[PDB]
Amino acid sequence: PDREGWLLKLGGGRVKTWKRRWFILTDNCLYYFEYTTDKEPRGIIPLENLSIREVDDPRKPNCFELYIPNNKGQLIKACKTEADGRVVEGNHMVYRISAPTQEEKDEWIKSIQAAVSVD
Numbered sequence: 001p002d003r004e005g006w007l008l009k010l011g012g013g014r015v016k017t018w019k020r021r022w023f024i025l026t027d028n029c030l031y032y033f034e035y036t037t038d039k040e041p042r043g044i045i046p047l048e049n050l051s052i053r054e055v056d057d058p059r060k061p062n063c064f065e066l067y068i069p070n071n072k073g074q075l076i077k078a079c080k081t082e083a084d085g086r087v088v089e090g091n092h093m094v095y096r097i098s099a100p101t102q103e104e105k106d107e108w109i110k111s112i113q114a115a116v117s118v119d
């Protein structure tokens, strides 16, 4: 793992709520878990063909988003796990994330940008 840490992630549909998740950046893939020691990830996000951009949020600090450039409306390819264990495709067009400090933000971006390239 090149980087791991707690981050708040925005999810839901109509009402979007922030969830604290444990992220693990590892070779072209960004995983996230509910608990720091869980064996199976709550989500896997392949980084190929994605970019990051900082964004401003009204309720949360140090945010940034994973997104598909020039997106005409497609969803980010990713797998997700359901409370019943069933695996399904992610339903995000973008992943908005909140880092605890501005420093953790720049590190995560630098780490992720570098993880999207040489692969």
Ligand SMILES: O=P(O)(O)O[C@H]1[C@H](O)[C@@H](OP(=O)(O)O)[C@H](OP(=O)(O)O)[C@@H](OP(=O)(O)O)[C@H]1O
Binding pocket: 009, 010, 011, 012, 013, 017, 019, 021, 042, 043, 080, 090, 091, 092
């Ligand atoms: O807990 P509640 O309030 O029900 O909201 C859930 C969680 O935020 C999920 O995050 P996590 O999987 O990290 O627990 C998220 O899945 P994503 O991981 O795909 O964001 C769901 O988004 P959608 O199922 O896509 O609407 C959203 O409905």
